[PDB]
Write an enzyme that holds these catalytic residues in place. Structure first.
Site, PDB file in Angstrom:
ATOM      1  N   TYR A  69       0.853  -1.193   0.000  1.00 26.62           N
ATOM      2  CA  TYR A  69       0.000   0.000   0.000  1.00 26.62           C
ATOM      3  C   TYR A  69       0.894   1.251   0.000  1.00 26.62           C
ATOM      4  CZ  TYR A  69       1.488  -0.235   4.743  1.00 26.62           C
ATOM      5  OH  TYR A  69       2.289  -0.297   5.852  1.00 26.62           O
TER       6      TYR A  69
ATOM      7  N   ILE B  27     -12.938  12.409 -11.581  1.00 27.77           N
ATOM      8  CA  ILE B  27     -13.029  11.682 -10.310  1.00 27.77           C
ATOM      9  C   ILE B  27     -13.186  10.163 -10.508  1.00 27.77           C
ATOM     10  CG2 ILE B  27     -15.511  12.072  -9.977  1.00 27.77           C
ATOM     11  CD1 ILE B  27     -15.575  11.871  -7.404  1.00 27.77           C
ATOM     12  N   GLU B  28     -13.792   9.741 -11.616  1.00 29.99           N
ATOM     13  CA  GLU B  28     -14.127   8.333 -11.939  1.00 29.99           C
ATOM     14  C   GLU B  28     -12.955   7.746 -12.674  1.00 29.99           C
ATOM     15  OE1 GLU B  28     -15.530  11.590 -13.160  1.00 29.99           O
ATOM     16  OE2 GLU B  28     -16.505  10.506 -14.841  1.00 29.99           O
TER      17      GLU B  28
ATOM     18  N   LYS C  99     -14.620  13.424  -3.354  1.00 29.87           N
ATOM     19  CA  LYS C  99     -14.324  14.860  -3.396  1.00 29.87           C
ATOM     20  C   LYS C  99     -15.174  15.556  -2.321  1.00 29.87           C
TER      21      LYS C  99
END
Lengths: 108, 108, 108, 108
Positions: D42, D61-62, D87
């Site tokens: 991670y 955003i997608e 957001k």
């Protein structure tokens, strides 16, 4: 049907670990228990988890989860357990605030 | 499809108990109700739960959950209920902050 | 597979209503959108929901949910929607802090 | 059975994006790892996600979610991933406080 949800046990190796456990398990008869812990002893679970984590440094985050999980599963009344071990991160930008492994076991 | 979620009822025996209830149940016609509580009366649910918990000390955490659950189930319009009773713990280190039983019932 | 989660719209009739909506819906092509709202216009959703709630007092909490739900479902690209309307309660003891209806729709 | 939950990575294009990732993936042997990140790194995920978002403004955003999702899926040990990009909105009344896309992938 019925479960017990144990949230927010803070244990030290120190670096904090926050632990949650859910235990799926039939509730004992009202006739036979004087506390919840008589169905499921989250008191001894919390000691054992604090020992596991405090122990000889050999403390991997998934290892803690797996050991907790198996420990809970020792008790044959548990249908399933879900153990989350969270290492809350020092807040440095562009990193995750929190990283957690979540371990599941069940028999059926 | 449709459910009602009732969060954060604080009731005393005192030691605090925090209760949540989800109720799966068809919503009545707009034509027939003047409030939500006409579909499902969470007002009387909250009194009943406060009485159950305040009553003659015989107050096990799972017993409260089971009684709440059955009480909700008395009303044959409920397809299922999920009742969580939380005993928020005095914050002492290496213990769980919160211990909760969650009871489920459904007919089908 | 893909969903859009819209949290914490505060709308007035005043008594506060807090609304969340999840929308299951295929994301448009990167080639064809200049914002998220081009896949799903949560901007017009938030106006419409504010009008619905602000309107002629005829404002039942489940009625708001059902109307929001159907409004979202008008758009045939939505596979399913889940609409939560929360009426945060004045904090009076032995009552629920929060009461919410959650409405679901889906076609398949 | 086992998953890794990474919460609250704050990344800038600036406008804040808060990212969560869940990764379903078998935990490596205790014998072979010196950290969690040896099962699932991670650390590099958080850099890569910070680069993706910081990059040439072309930042939907997608699109961020889909790229994160595919990036995680490159590693054939992942059974499935769920990526949420949030957001957090400037708090203006009658709008959503938070708008998020959540992307899922799995092979089986």
């Amino acid at each position: 049907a019925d479960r017990i949800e144990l949230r927010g046990l803070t244990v030290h190796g120190g670096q904090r670990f926050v632990i949650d456990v859910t235990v799926w398990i039939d509730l004992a008869e009202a006739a036979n228990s004087d506390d919840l812990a008589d169905t499921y002893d989250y008191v001894r679970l919390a000691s054992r988890a604090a020992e596991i984590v405090a122990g000889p440094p050999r403390k991997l985050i998934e290892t803690v989860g797996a050991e907790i999980a198996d420990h809970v599963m020792d008790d044959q009344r548990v249908h399933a357990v879900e153990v989350a071990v969270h290492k809350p991160q020092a807040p440095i930008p562009q990193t995750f605030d929190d990283v957690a492994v979540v371990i599941r076991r069940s028999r059926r």
